[PDB]
Design an enzyme around this catalytic site. Structure first.
Site, mmCIF file in Angstrom:
data_model
loop_
_atom_site.group_PDB
_atom_site.id
_atom_site.type_symbol
_atom_site.label_atom_id
_atom_site.label_comp_id
_atom_site.label_asym_id
_atom_site.label_seq_id
_atom_site.Cartn_x
_atom_site.Cartn_y
_atom_site.Cartn_z
ATOM 1 N N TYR C 90 0.798 -1.224 0.000
ATOM 2 C CA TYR C 90 0.000 0.000 0.000
ATOM 3 C C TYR C 90 0.832 1.276 0.000
ATOM 4 O O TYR C 90 0.630 2.127 -0.870
ATOM 5 C CB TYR C 90 -0.966 0.011 1.189
ATOM 6 C CG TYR C 90 -1.850 1.238 1.212
ATOM 7 C CD1 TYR C 90 -2.421 1.724 0.045
ATOM 8 C CD2 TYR C 90 -2.107 1.913 2.395
ATOM 9 C CE1 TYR C 90 -3.221 2.842 0.054
ATOM 10 C CE2 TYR C 90 -2.910 3.034 2.415
ATOM 11 C CZ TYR C 90 -3.463 3.493 1.241
ATOM 12 O OH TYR C 90 -4.264 4.610 1.253
ATOM 13 N N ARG C 143 -3.837 14.188 -6.009
ATOM 14 C CA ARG C 143 -2.974 14.315 -4.835
ATOM 15 C C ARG C 143 -2.583 12.915 -4.377
ATOM 16 O O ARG C 143 -3.217 12.333 -3.496
ATOM 17 C CB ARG C 143 -3.679 15.109 -3.734
ATOM 18 C CG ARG C 143 -2.768 15.626 -2.636
ATOM 19 C CD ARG C 143 -2.754 14.689 -1.443
ATOM 20 N NE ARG C 143 -4.101 14.439 -0.943
ATOM 21 C CZ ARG C 143 -4.409 13.497 -0.059
ATOM 22 N NH1 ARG C 143 -3.464 12.704 0.426
ATOM 23 N NH2 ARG C 143 -5.665 13.344 0.338
ATOM 24 N N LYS C 161 -4.840 -0.326 -1.933
ATOM 25 C CA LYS C 161 -5.702 -0.114 -0.778
ATOM 26 C C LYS C 161 -6.680 -1.263 -0.610
ATOM 27 O O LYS C 161 -6.858 -1.778 0.499
ATOM 28 C CB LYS C 161 -6.459 1.203 -0.914
ATOM 29 C CG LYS C 161 -7.047 1.697 0.385
ATOM 30 C CD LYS C 161 -7.664 3.067 0.223
ATOM 31 C CE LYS C 161 -7.777 3.770 1.558
ATOM 32 N NZ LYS C 161 -6.445 4.110 2.121
ATOM 33 N N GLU C 233 -10.364 8.295 -2.502
ATOM 34 C CA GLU C 233 -8.969 8.154 -2.113
ATOM 35 C C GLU C 233 -8.093 9.058 -2.962
ATOM 36 O O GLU C 233 -8.118 8.979 -4.194
ATOM 37 C CB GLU C 233 -8.503 6.703 -2.241
ATOM 38 C CG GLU C 233 -7.131 6.444 -1.640
ATOM 39 C CD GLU C 233 -7.079 6.661 -0.136
ATOM 40 O OE1 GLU C 233 -5.959 6.723 0.413
ATOM 41 O OE2 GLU C 233 -8.147 6.756 0.504
ATOM 42 N N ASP C 234 -7.319 9.910 -2.294
ATOM 43 C CA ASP C 234 -6.298 10.736 -2.937
ATOM 44 C C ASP C 234 -6.891 11.668 -3.992
ATOM 45 O O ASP C 234 -6.351 11.813 -5.088
ATOM 46 C CB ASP C 234 -5.190 9.869 -3.535
ATOM 47 C CG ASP C 234 -4.107 9.537 -2.524
ATOM 48 O OD1 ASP C 234 -3.915 10.327 -1.577
ATOM 49 O OD2 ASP C 234 -3.450 8.488 -2.673
ATOM 50 N N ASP C 256 -10.991 8.644 4.126
ATOM 51 C CA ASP C 256 -9.985 8.180 5.075
ATOM 52 C C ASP C 256 -9.079 9.313 5.535
ATOM 53 O O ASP C 256 -8.658 9.348 6.697
ATOM 54 C CB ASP C 256 -9.156 7.065 4.447
ATOM 55 C CG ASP C 256 -8.789 5.993 5.438
ATOM 56 O OD1 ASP C 256 -8.168 4.996 5.022
ATOM 57 O OD2 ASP C 256 -9.121 6.145 6.632
ATOM 58 N N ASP C 257 -8.756 10.240 4.635
ATOM 59 C CA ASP C 257 -7.841 11.322 4.979
ATOM 60 C C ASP C 257 -8.438 12.226 6.050
ATOM 61 O O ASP C 257 -7.732 12.702 6.945
ATOM 62 C CB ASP C 257 -7.492 12.123 3.727
ATOM 63 C CG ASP C 257 -6.642 11.335 2.752
ATOM 64 O OD1 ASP C 257 -5.877 10.456 3.203
ATOM 65 O OD2 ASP C 257 -6.743 11.587 1.533
ATOM 66 N N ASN C 399 3.509 12.769 7.100
ATOM 67 C CA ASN C 399 4.489 11.864 6.525
ATOM 68 C C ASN C 399 4.771 12.330 5.103
ATOM 69 O O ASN C 399 3.932 13.014 4.503
ATOM 70 C CB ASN C 399 3.980 10.416 6.528
ATOM 71 C CG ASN C 399 2.644 10.271 5.833
ATOM 72 O OD1 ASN C 399 1.906 11.244 5.680
ATOM 73 N ND2 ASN C 399 2.324 9.055 5.411
#
Ligand SMILES: NC(=O)c1ccc[n+]([C@@H]2O[C@H](COP(=O)([O-])OP(=O)(O)OC[C@H]3O[C@@H](n4cnc5c(N)ncnc54)[C@H](O)[C@@H]3O)[C@@H](O)[C@H]2O)c1
Ligand SMILES: NC(=O)c1ccc[n+]([C@@H]2O[C@H](COP(=O)([O-])OP(=O)(O)OC[C@H]3O[C@@H](n4cnc5c(N)ncnc54)[C@H](O)[C@@H]3O)[C@@H](O)[C@H]2O)c1
Ligand SMILES: NC(=O)c1ccc[n+]([C@@H]2O[C@H](COP(=O)([O-])OP(=O)(O)OC[C@H]3O[C@@H](n4cnc5c(N)ncnc54)[C@H](O)[C@@H]3O)[C@@H](O)[C@H]2O)c1
Ligand SMILES: NC(=O)c1ccc[n+]([C@@H]2O[C@H](COP(=O)([O-])OP(=O)(O)OC[C@H]3O[C@@H](n4cnc5c(N)ncnc54)[C@H](O)[C@@H]3O)[C@@H](O)[C@H]2O)c1
Ligand SMILES: NC(=O)c1ccc[n+]([C@@H]2O[C@H](COP(=O)([O-])OP(=O)(O)OC[C@H]3O[C@@H](n4cnc5c(N)ncnc54)[C@H](O)[C@@H]3O)[C@@H](O)[C@H]2O)c1
Ligand SMILES: NC(=O)c1ccc[n+]([C@@H]2O[C@H](COP(=O)([O-])OP(=O)(O)OC[C@H]3O[C@@H](n4cnc5c(N)ncnc54)[C@H](O)[C@@H]3O)[C@@H](O)[C@H]2O)c1
Ligand SMILES: O=C(O)c1cc(Cc2ccc(O)c(C(=O)O)c2)ccc1O
Ligand SMILES: O=C(O)c1cc(Cc2ccc(O)c(C(=O)O)c2)ccc1O
Ligand SMILES: O=C(O)c1cc(Cc2ccc(O)c(C(=O)O)c2)ccc1O
Lengths: 551, 551, 551
Positions: C90, C143, C161, C233-234, C256-257, C399
């Site tokens: 992942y 992103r 994922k 996601e993203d 999730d973010d 991160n």
């Protein structure tokens, strides 16, 4: 799917309704005659061909061939002319076809589960292609209506029945599964001929058969879920009654012979109390027999009396079942079972040993022929009842006509037309010498079972209670208009059964949500739109892939 | 293949011949009735059902349903009782079925190529599933035997014909392809009804139709090779004759109406010369007509005379065709085409204007009814010929019976039984008043076309010469035993046609290798074993995967 | 399925786990090497091969090849060694693989929906083979974590994922669907190279993109139901935040973010309050940033304070977010949005313009690095906080390590080990000169999102509320044992994440049924057994048909 398997599959087969562009894109070009036909031309053609045929069995062969070929056109044909094709598709033509021609299906239908396959029923169920089935009709072949034991040849009974499930209610054809469980045949003729197609042993009545039924139901509910609707069609009376009692709580099982017939008879009685001034609770009822079918009818009647506020004991006091030995009464020499105990009332002074004397002393307002021993309703008892009651209510639920307790023509002619008559057997309109032609209402289960089945399927009901059929009977009675009641009809016409079934479903659906017996959530705000959306539509759907050009 | 598609495919479907282990391994368990039946039980059952039916059209519907369901059992049924089921499967019951019921096939058969599909025939051919086909039968529907123009409904003519290809010769069913090319229908009734299934234009006779035929043949030979056998069945006389002349050299084409009939008639004549002491070259022949069919028959006859050493001119001198206008003669007022020029002989003194006078002056030994104008063979001319010849040879090749030039019963009774009679129409044995029942031989193409087709398929022949049919006729005549000749039969019995066809193939195969017209190499040392191995066997083959345990 | 397609299908492919009898019955014999291997030998072999490889990208290529070949063995490999293979599968190895190698998948994965396909998204969704999908992960590629805009190459982000979805929670692989919506790429390098695989336009930011998202969600919920779980996601921060706000009520969407990270941070805080004597409500919190992610974290914190009985206003008073301009305060010159309004408190006397001075005046007990502007946590502010608080709580959620606000080694060494440190980036254990090695807890979303997703899937939840993540955070904190808290760990070890995820699901499931947000009825009596039954097991299942012999 593409190419030839597209036509070979009856679900996706369109015949010549394949548009030219569909034929070219899907590779069907050249395998079909050059003409392109709408579904209307196809239905008109097959209706003309059907009009050419003259015998109901030939019509059955033709229509089942159409079903095996193209299902959507078959269901359009069936729905288009349903009053005339219903006897062809389900009853009594299915019995005659199964008896004379045995197995005619040129395509795999349903499942064949044998007692030699005991211990491995789950694999047999796994062999069935469809992944999701909602309705299952199980037959043993022991008691085909009017033909006794047909063994494994009774598989036409579920399949034809399932056609009604789609023709009236709107259940999807691929969610239905007809299952025939054969444990042998009891009749000698089938055991003797070499071309019988099944087990050559005599019917097995041991614990192996019960364990086979248990294993089959467990295997079907394991693969398709706990809420799968399983219906036992044309078992033996003992087997069907016992299995309904055993599996009613555990699984989603309802039996049409016991429960649907009670709903239809109660619906007829409610239509009668709409026609007659007096209510149901006021007048007492006399039954020709007292069995679990008769007890089911009387249970529906007492529930209908109770829901109107009248006490359960007072409602039970009204029904007076009459056994084979004699009138069901306390202290009687003959045995009384526990189920028929509630309708065991005080001794009449005469204690009549004959049915005519029973009517004479009891003076019932309603008579119901549930016993079906044969031609029991003599003209004498009919005249006696017509003298007793201003507008007697006479029910002859047994079929066929020869087995019926009375004939609609005789019942209407013998009285001055005051009686209200409803019979299972179909009878033509009866015209008296003076005039006033009377059309006897026909009460068959096709009114009740499709709509109830659709509602139970849509609501994901796990346990079908006995009050569901009371609600269905109330809905069926409410279907009738005022003019129909004035004409003397007790049931809605069979020409427009589909909408009737839909309406029945709606009512049952509402009931299933009002009593917390439906597990489909979120609960729809309007039940009518929900059920009308969920139904299957027998209209061709374009298979053209969407072709567009990117900018 | 596994599961349900194994039964849905008629090629691999076994019905209940699926052994229990096959059902369990292949996933068919539970989808079939519990009984396991050998093929013999299946055939016996269907033979009993067939005996129950009483009308040939109903038999046709039943047998075609069997074919659509299980092909191997259908071919076992057909081969098992072939003499009685041949009229049902090919002629004349196919014409009646196509006329009355139109298109009955519940499964895709062959290809439908229309003139609206011109320019794209290759795609239509590509739509056909089978990758290797060896035989193709093409129909236009313009001239169905005895029913005129049926348009697109003539597709039953190829399919039924192909059944014979497998029932008699042994050609594999999946190597056959029935093709119907419809360019419209000429009859008004089909154009008028809304349920006609095809083009609603009148038949197209322009250059478009010829170009469509050219394109179809090119497309079929492109996909399936140059050696694919293509047969034109039931075209119009003009179209069939012209297309045979045009495509005989280019493609592997033989026409049954023109070439097979000549072979059958010549085989009858050879059987006659085996019965009668005098040879064929000694006696002259009179034809009822002079057309490309009659010219083909006469060409086969002159070839048979030549192969025996007699000169071509002397052999041609024997045949005296008789036209519609009059006897075909040099200097005649009527037109003489180039094809019929060789049989244009010196003027007789009378120059008779009637057929009876033609027989009286010419005194022919053999008469052949190839014209088929109707009931032309009057009793007067029959008696005149019987007076002229000790054992006259009378041929009435036209069918049906009403269209025939003579009736076998009348021909045999009118003479003292001396005549030798062979007709296309089937006739029952004729018993005279004194005695000596005579069975008139029936000459139909089913003797010739299956065996010749099998030999051509096995030998990879690219061009079917006219001498192949002479060799086939010699083989068919040699099939007869001495006792059959003594009985007066001119053709082998139809009860054992299969072996006859096989034997015919053998002879043709040998001929095809002797004259360097066969392109299958290496040339087999024995032709009989080669052809007997190559034939299709209608026996079920086990589908069990081989299960063993490693050491 | 039978024969070669059985191996070609990764769902049913077994490699050499096909037993000899399975190979013989299913027709796989001869297509496989003679050896028969259990799944253990297969996993051992691939683990050895994986140990041979030395670079994470090569490991990613190898493991994804295994997934494309055999999925069950791939998931056994992943579950067998999950702590080391989770970075490979992942993050961050997926980003590196997508950037360097672009698209590597040799098999179709998920769907590619482009803005050129607008208006026809339903057909694209219909093209997907699987009939029932429960989880959908949607990426825009705008992103990618640490790599900016990858355009269409971000499709590896959903697929990887989804592997976690099956590796940790137990969601069936065939119920998952990775979707990549590409509206162009913004980076020049992808637009310039000819081998880019997607749209060559710059990213579309107009109403067309929003309408495309609306249409895609409508089409996916039409085919797969309203309760299908869809996760964004993203996406870009603006797009993801706006779409979560827009679709949270209508569809079953959780991001999730925004939401998972808040749950993980709150779980860390609860573990801290279990380690530290003082409760969460007693001590105030200072954030490095104030955005919808920071507002989500603070919302989870205030909800956790409220559920313990402390008032909402008092709980809100504790959090003091710090913006880019300065401390978030009432009357500030800088703009204050409506979402960040609740945490807008009275003015401090100093009104510090720097973060260090903000810590000095406010004296927070907890610090959270949610801003992620870079390396913001200077050693000076860390020492100041360590002086202020006896056991300071420091969170560096950003991160990778370079982007992190602080380094775990520096944070632990600079203080005497009193601080509690949790970071998104993985850090090795830090050992001080005197001793007392400290292992900094790592908080990644893989703790939260799989279990929450499994619970939502099993409960048929239509709307994922914000309190579900609070319940998940409480469950994750309760996973920790007393000895782990004594060691100083704030999160459960990643070596046994699967059971942790399962436990999380259980708690959430109970919550979903306690608050009437779960529509799966009947409600199970025990949630633990229900969820443990529903999970997917990566064990080979025998394909042998059941073979038995009838008596
Ligand atoms: N082309 C197709 O065949 C097609 C297309 C769309 C949906 N479907 C079917 O719709 C189902 C989705 O279920 P849902 O979202 O409608 O649940 P639902 O909430 O609308 O209905 C609840 C239950 O009633 C069953 N049901 C609904 N309509 C039925 C009908 N006409 N006949 C028999 N049973 C019926 C459903 O299977 C379901 O189990 C899929 O399983 C799929 O099989 C099929
Ligand atoms: N599918 C249907 O249409 C349907 C449904 C329900 C009932 N029925 C009718 O019910 C009958 C069988 O059902 P069942 O459950 O009642 O059978 P059963 O075996 O359970 O009991 C039959 C009852 O009829 C009584 N009886 C029999 N002969 C009698 C006689 N000569 N005089 C007086 N009483 C007599 C008996 O006392 C007995 O109680 C059939 O006539 C059948 O047509 C039909
Ligand atoms: N299970 C099966 O269906 C099966 C099994 C074995 C072989 N075959 C067939 O055998 C063919 C191999 O050709 P061959 O080695 O026999 O060449 P061959 O030399 O024996 O025969 C020459 C030609 O005659 C054709 N032919 C042979 N027998 C025929 C028959 N009974 N009916 C119609 N045509 C026939 C052949 O297709 C070939 O083109 C394969 O193309 C394959 O289609 C099929
Ligand atoms: N499939 C078969 O069984 C088959 C095969 C070949 C021929 N035939 C028969 O041949 C006939 C048609 O074939 P064709 O090629 O000869 O047709 P055609 O159109 O090519 O020519 C018909 C010939 O018959 C002659 N003729 C017609 N009427 C005559 C009359 N009243 N008196 C004398 N002569 C007359 C004409 O002169 C003409 O030459 C049919 O009777 C048909 O039954 C049948
Ligand atoms: N050989 C197979 O692939 C196989 C065998 C048996 C059942 N199934 C599946 O079981 C389903 C029947 O649903 P149910 O009776 O378990 O309903 P359920 O009441 O047990 O669960 C409710 C919902 O949770 C979903 N779900 C359950 N387990 C899941 C899991 N491990 N991963 C992802 N989603 C899960 C279900 O699809 C269902 O929609 C069938 O649709 C069928 O697809 C598959
Ligand atoms: N997937 C994850 O692991 C995850 C999840 C949530 C948040 N984050 C972290 O959150 C950050 C982005 O999320 P977001 O929603 O907060 O972005 P955002 O665009 O919504 O707002 C960023 C906030 O940070 C503040 N800020 C920026 N620079 C600052 C500085 N030098 N000094 C003080 N304050 C500053 C700004 O005032 C602003 O309020 C990233 O660091 C990201 O690593 C990561
Ligand atoms: O799709 C269509 O309309 C269609 C209809 C037919 C006609 C037909 C079908 C079944 C029969 O049993 C009979 C008969 O026996 O008369 C006739 C044939 C092919 C088609 O494609
Ligand atoms: O394989 C078998 O032997 C087999 C035979 C039958 C009987 C049958 C078939 C076609 C018919 O048309 C009729 C009829 O109409 O009488 C009857 C059914 C299923 C089978 O599997
Ligand atoms: O099922 C099995 O165990 C199985 C395993 C292998 C070995 C293998 C697979 C993928 C690889 O990438 C590499 C390599 O590149 O070293 C090697 C091959 C066939 C099998 O059937």
């Amino acid at each position: 799917e593409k190419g030839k398997p597209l036509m070979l599959n009856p679900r996706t087969n369109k015949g010549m309704a394949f548009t030219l562009q569909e034929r070219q894109m899907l590779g069907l070009q050249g395998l079909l005659p050059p003409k392109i036909e709408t579904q209307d031309i196809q239905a008109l053609r097959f209706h003309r061909n059907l009009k050419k045929m003259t015998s109901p069995l030939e019509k059955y062969i033709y229509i089942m061939g159409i079903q095996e070929r193209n299902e959507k056109l078959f269901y359009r044909i069936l729905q288009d002319d349903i009053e005339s094709l219903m006897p062809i598709v389900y009853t009594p033509t299915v019995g005659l076809a199964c008896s004379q021609y045995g197995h005619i299906f040129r395509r795999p239908k349903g499942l064949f589960i044998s007692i030699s396959d005991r211990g491995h029923v789950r694999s047999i169920v796994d062999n069935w292609p469809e992944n999701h089935v909602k309705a299952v009709v199980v037959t043993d072949g022991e008691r085909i209506l009017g033909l006794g034991d047909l063994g494994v040849y009774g598989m036409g009974i579920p399949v034809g029945k399932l056609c009604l499930y789609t023709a009236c209610a709107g259940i999807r054809p691929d969610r239905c599964l007809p299952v025939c469980i054969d444990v042998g045949t009891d009749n000698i003729a089938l055991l003797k001929d070499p071309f019988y197609m099944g087990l050559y042993q005599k019917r097995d009545r041991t614990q192996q058969y019960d364990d086979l039924i248990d294993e089959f139901m467990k295997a079907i509910t394991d693969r398709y879920g706990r809420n799968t609707l399983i219906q036992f069609e044309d078992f033996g009376n003992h087997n069907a009654f016992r299995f309904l009692r055993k599996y009613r709580e555990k699984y989603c099982t309802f039996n049409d012979d016991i429960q649907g017939t009670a709903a239809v008879a109660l619906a007829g009685l409610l239509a009668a109390q709409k026609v007659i001034s007096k209510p149901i609770s006021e007048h007492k009822i006399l039954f020709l027999g007292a069995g679990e079918a008769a007890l089911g009818i009387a249970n529906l009647i007492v529930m209908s009396m109770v829901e109107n506020g009248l006490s359960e004991q007072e409602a039970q006091k009204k029904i007076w079942m009459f056994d084979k030995y004699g009138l069901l009464v306390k202290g009687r020499k003959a045995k009384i079972d526990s189920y028929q105990e509630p309708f065991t009332h005080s001794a009449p002074e005469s204690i009549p040993d004959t049915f005519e004397d029973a009517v004479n002393i009891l003076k019932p307002s309603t008579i119901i022929g549930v016993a079906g021993a044969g031609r029991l309703f003599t003209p004498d008892v009919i005249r006696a009842m017509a003298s007793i009651n201003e507008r007697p209510v006479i029910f002859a639920l047994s079929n066929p006509t020869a087995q019926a307790e009375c004939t609609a023509e005789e019942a209407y002619t013998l009285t001055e037309g005051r009686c209200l008559f409803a019979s299972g057997s179909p009878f033509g309109p009866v015209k008296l010498t003076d005039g006033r032609v009377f059309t006897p209402g026909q009460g068959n289960n096709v009114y009740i079972f499709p709509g109830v089945a659709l509602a139970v399927i849509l609501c994901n009901t796990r346990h079908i209670s006995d009050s569901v059929f009371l609600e269905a009977a109330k809905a069926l009675t409410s279907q009738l208009t005022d003019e129909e009641l004035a004409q003397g009809r007790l049931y809605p016409p069979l020409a427009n059964i589909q909408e009737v079934s839909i309406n029945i479903a709606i009512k049952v659906t509402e009931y299933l949500y009002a009593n917390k017996m439906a597990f489909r959530y979120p609960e729809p705000e309007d039940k009518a739109k929900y059920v009308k959306e969920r139904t299957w539509r027998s209209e061709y759907d374009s298979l053209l892939p969407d072709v567009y050009e990117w900018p």
